């Protein structure tokens, strides 16, 4: 149908906007602490601590499959990255500190993304 196509164009454009958002968020992690999944070879107990792991490469896979329906779903995944880190690592670690800084810097990006998603529809 013509409607299904229109819908698919919207999703494609949302995917386009979310790709730019993801790139901006990932620039706020210059140490690449959150670039890849926590290695289960190197942290073998990780899933005993963290039930829903997340990282930027995994979000990018979902993104490119057009697997985010709305900004809320994308933000859920970004919040998992931060929140998982802040639980597994202690306050006095470079990891925790990196997550705080990513959260703080990311807020600005996400604030305008929400306005753009609402605005453009």
Cα separation of 36 and 62, whole Å? 14
DSSP conformation class of 35: S
Please name the residue that has the structure tokens 């979000």.
59
Cα separation of 61 and 99, whole Å? 21
With contact defined as beta carbons under 8 Å apart, do 55 and 77 qualify?
no
Dihedral (CA of 34, 37, 43, 46) sign = positive
Instruction: Provide the terminal-to-terminal Cα distance of the chain, rounded to the nearest Å.
Output: 21
Tell me, in Å, the resolution of the deposited structure: 1.6
Way the structure was solved: X-ray
Query: Which two tokens mark 3?
Result: 């409607």
Query: Which two tokens mark 42?
Result: 């190197």
In the chain the domains, ranked by start, together with CATH numbers, are 1-121 (1.20.920.10)
Closest C-alpha to 35, from 20, 50, 55: 55
Query: Which two tokens mark 6?
Result: 């229109």
Report how far Cα 57 is from the mean position of its chain's Cα atoms.
9
**Among the residues of the chain, which ranges form H helices?**
2-27, 46-49, 56-64, 71-88, 94-120
Query: Which two tokens mark 66?
Result: 């057009």
């Amino acid at each position: 149908s013509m409607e299904q196509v229109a819908m698919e164009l919207r999703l494609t454009e949302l995917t386009r906007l979310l790709r730019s958002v993801l790139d901006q968020l990932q620039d706020k992690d210059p140490a690449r602490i959150f670039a890849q999944p926590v290695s289960l070879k190197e942290v073998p107990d990780y899933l005993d601590h963290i039930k829903h792991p997340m990282d930027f490469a995994t979000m990018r896979k979902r993104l490119e499959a057009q697997g985010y329906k709305n900004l809320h779903e994308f933000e859920e995944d970004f919040d998992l990255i931060i929140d998982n880190c802040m639980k597994y690592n202690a306050r006095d670690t470079v990891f925790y500190r990196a997550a705080v800084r990513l959260r703080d810097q990311g807020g600005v990006v996400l604030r305008q993304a929400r306005r753009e998603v609402d605005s453009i529809g």
